[PDB]
Short mmCIF file of C-alpha atoms in Angstrom, two decimals:
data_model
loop_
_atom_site.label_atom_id
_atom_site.label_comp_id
_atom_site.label_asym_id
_atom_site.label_seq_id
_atom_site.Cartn_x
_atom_site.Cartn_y
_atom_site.Cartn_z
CA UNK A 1 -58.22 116.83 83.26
CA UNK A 2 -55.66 115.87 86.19
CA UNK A 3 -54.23 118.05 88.89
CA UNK A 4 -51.70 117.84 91.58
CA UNK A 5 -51.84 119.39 94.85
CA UNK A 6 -49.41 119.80 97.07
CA UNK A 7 -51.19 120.44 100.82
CA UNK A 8 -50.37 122.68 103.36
CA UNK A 9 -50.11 119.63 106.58
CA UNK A 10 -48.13 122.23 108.80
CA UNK A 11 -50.67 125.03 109.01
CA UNK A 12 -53.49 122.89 108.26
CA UNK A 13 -53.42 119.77 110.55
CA UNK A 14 -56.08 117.24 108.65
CA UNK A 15 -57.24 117.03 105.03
CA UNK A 16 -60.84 117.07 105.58
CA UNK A 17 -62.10 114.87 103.43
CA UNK A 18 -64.71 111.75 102.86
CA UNK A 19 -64.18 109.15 100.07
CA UNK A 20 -66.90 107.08 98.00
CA UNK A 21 -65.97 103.84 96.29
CA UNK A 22 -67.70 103.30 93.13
CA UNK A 23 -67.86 99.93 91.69
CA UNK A 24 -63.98 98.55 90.63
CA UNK A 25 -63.78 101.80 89.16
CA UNK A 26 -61.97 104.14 91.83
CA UNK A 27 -62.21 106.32 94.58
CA UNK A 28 -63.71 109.67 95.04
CA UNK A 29 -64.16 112.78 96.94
CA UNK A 30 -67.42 112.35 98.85
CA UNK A 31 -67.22 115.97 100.82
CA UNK A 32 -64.73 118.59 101.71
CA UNK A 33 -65.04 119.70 105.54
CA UNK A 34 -64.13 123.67 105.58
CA UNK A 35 -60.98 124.66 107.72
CA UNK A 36 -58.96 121.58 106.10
CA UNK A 37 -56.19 121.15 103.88
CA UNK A 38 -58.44 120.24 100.77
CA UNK A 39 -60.80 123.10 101.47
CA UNK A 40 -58.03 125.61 101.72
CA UNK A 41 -56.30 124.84 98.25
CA UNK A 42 -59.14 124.92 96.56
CA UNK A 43 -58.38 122.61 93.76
CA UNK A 44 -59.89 119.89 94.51
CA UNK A 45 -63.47 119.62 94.31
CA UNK A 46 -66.36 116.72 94.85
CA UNK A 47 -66.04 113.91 92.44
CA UNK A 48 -63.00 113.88 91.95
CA UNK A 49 -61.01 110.71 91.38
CA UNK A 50 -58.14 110.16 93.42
CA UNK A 51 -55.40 108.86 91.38
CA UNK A 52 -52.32 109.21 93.82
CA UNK A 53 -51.09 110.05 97.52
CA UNK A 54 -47.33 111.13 97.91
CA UNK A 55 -46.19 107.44 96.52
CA UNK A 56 -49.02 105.26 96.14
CA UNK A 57 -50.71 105.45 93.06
CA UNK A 58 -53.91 103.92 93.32
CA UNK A 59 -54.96 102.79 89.23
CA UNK A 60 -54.46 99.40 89.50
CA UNK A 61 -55.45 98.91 93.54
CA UNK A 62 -58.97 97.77 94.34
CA UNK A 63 -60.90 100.48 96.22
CA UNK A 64 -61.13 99.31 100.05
CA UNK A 65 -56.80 98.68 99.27
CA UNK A 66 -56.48 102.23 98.11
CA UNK A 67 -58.40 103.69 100.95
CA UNK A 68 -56.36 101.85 103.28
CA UNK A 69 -53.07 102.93 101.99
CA UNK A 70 -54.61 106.79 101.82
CA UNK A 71 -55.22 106.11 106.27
CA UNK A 72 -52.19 105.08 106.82
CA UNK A 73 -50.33 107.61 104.63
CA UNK A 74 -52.37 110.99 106.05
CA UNK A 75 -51.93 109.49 109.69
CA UNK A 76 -48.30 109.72 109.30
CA UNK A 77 -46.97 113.16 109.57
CA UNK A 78 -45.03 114.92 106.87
CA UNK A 79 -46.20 116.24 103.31
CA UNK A 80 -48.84 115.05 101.22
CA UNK A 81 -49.21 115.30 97.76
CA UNK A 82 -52.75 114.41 95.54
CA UNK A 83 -52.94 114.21 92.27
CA UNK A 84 -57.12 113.65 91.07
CA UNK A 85 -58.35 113.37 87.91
CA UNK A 86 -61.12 116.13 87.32
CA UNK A 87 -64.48 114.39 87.12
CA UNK A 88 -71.58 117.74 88.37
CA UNK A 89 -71.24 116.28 91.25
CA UNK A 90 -72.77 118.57 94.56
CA UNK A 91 -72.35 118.10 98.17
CA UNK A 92 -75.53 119.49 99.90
CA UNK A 93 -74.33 117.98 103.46
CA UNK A 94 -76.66 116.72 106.05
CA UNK A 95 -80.86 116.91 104.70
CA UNK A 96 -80.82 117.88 108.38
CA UNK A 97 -79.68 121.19 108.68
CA UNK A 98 -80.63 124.24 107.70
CA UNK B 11 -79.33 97.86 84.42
CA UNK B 12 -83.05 96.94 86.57
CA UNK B 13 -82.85 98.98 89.68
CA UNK B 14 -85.76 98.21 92.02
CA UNK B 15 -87.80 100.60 93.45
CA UNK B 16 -88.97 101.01 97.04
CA UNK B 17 -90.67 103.33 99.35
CA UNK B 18 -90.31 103.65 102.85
CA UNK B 19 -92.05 105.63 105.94
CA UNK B 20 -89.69 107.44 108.46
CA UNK B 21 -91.07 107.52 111.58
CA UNK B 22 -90.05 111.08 112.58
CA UNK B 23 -91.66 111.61 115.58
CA UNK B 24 -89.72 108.60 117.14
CA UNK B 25 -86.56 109.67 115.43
CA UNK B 26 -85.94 113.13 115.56
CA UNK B 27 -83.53 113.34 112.60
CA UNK B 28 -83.80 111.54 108.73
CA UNK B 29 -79.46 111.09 108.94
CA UNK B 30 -79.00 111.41 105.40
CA UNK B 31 -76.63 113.51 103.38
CA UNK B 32 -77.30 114.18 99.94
CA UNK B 33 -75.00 114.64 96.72
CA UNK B 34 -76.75 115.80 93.17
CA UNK B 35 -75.44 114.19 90.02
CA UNK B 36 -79.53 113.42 86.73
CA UNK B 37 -80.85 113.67 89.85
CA UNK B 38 -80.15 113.55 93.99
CA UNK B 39 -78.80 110.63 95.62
CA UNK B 40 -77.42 109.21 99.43
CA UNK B 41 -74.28 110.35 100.08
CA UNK B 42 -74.09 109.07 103.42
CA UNK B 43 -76.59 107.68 106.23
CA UNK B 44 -76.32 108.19 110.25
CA UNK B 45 -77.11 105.46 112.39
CA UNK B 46 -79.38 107.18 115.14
CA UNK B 47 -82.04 108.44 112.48
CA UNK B 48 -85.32 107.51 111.06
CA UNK B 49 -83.60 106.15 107.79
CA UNK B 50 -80.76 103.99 109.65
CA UNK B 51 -83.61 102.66 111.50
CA UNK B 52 -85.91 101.57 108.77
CA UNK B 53 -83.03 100.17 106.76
CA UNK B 54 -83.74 99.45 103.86
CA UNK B 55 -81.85 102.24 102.25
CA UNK B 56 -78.25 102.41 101.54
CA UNK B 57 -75.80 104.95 100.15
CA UNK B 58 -76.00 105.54 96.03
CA UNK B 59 -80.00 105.04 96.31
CA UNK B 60 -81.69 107.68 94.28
CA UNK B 61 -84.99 109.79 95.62
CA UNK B 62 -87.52 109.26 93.73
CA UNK B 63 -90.51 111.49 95.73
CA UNK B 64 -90.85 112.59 99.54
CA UNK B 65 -94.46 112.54 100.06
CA UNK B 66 -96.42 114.46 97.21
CA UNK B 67 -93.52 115.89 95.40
CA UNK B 68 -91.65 113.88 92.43
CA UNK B 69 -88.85 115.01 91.83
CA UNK B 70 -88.32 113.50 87.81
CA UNK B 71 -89.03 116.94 86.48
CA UNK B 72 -87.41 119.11 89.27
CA UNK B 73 -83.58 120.34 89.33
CA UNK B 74 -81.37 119.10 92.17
CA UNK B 75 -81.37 122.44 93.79
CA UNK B 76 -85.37 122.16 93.59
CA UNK B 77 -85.26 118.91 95.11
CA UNK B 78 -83.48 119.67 98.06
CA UNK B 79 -84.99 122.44 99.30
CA UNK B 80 -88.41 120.99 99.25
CA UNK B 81 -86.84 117.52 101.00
CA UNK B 82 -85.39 120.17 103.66
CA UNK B 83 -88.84 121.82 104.27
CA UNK B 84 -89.99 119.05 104.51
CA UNK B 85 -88.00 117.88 107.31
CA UNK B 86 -88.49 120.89 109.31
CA UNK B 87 -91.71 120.34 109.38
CA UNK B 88 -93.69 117.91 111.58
CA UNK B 89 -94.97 114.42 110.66
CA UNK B 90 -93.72 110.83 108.56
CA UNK B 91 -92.29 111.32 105.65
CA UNK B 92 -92.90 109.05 102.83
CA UNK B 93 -89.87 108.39 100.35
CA UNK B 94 -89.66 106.30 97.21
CA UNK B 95 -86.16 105.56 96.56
CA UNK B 96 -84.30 104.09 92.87
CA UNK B 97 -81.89 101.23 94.34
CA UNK B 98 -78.86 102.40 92.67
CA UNK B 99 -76.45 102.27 94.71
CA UNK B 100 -75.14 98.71 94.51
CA UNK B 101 -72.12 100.23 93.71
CA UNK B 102 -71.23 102.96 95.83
CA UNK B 103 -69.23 102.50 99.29
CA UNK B 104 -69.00 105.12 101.53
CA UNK B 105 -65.71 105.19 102.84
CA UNK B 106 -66.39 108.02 105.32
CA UNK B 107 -63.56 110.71 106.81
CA UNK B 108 -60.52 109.62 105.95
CA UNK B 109 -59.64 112.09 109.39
CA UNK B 110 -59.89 110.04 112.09
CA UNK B 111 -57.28 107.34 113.00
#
């Protein structure tokens, strides 16, 4: 149901990741970009809800507030921890591409 | 719980790319659009719409996987493209990369 992920920010330098607001109800994963944080633990998938970010916990924030806390908190360096809540949802990237 | 319905023609000889992501739920939807393409330009469609059809091919009674790859042959391929689209997505903001300062 939840999980908590501590990322790697010294070997990986970014998190690689887009969020969706849905309306408010929270914020989501949108897409994972390979050769990021995210991507590397695994864990965390698209669709997930974000629930947290090292100290900000994001229930009771309104969406476009929560994603503005998460910028300023992964543009600062140090250690980042997520915690999601688990929630068939695919990312088939740009219609564009092969 | 009404969601309009609309349908649009992309103009892809003008525009040399749709600019659309897609994320599968029930059925596929806009994940994201890029300004620059053929759906940016028409405008009428916004992130959380729903496909409906691309030209002869409805997609109520195909899966997601189904879906896409017959959208992304259909973009390889020359010509307009004619999409209906659900307007569902009142309620979905994309945020974009949270990367980038």
């Amino acid at each position: 149901n939840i999980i908590t992920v501590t990322l790697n920010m010294e070997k990986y330098n970014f998190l690689g990741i887009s969020i969706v607001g849905q309306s408010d109800g929270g914020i989501y994963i949108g897409s994972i970009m390979k050769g990021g944080a995210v991507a590397a633990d695994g864990r965390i998938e698209p669709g997930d809800m974000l629930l947290q970010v090292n100290d900000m916990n994001f229930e009771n924030m309104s969406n476009d507030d929560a994603v503005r806390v998460l910028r300023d908190i992964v543009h600062k360096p140090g250690p980042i921890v997520l915690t999601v809540a688990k929630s068939g949802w695919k990312d088939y990237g740009w219609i564009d591409g092969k």
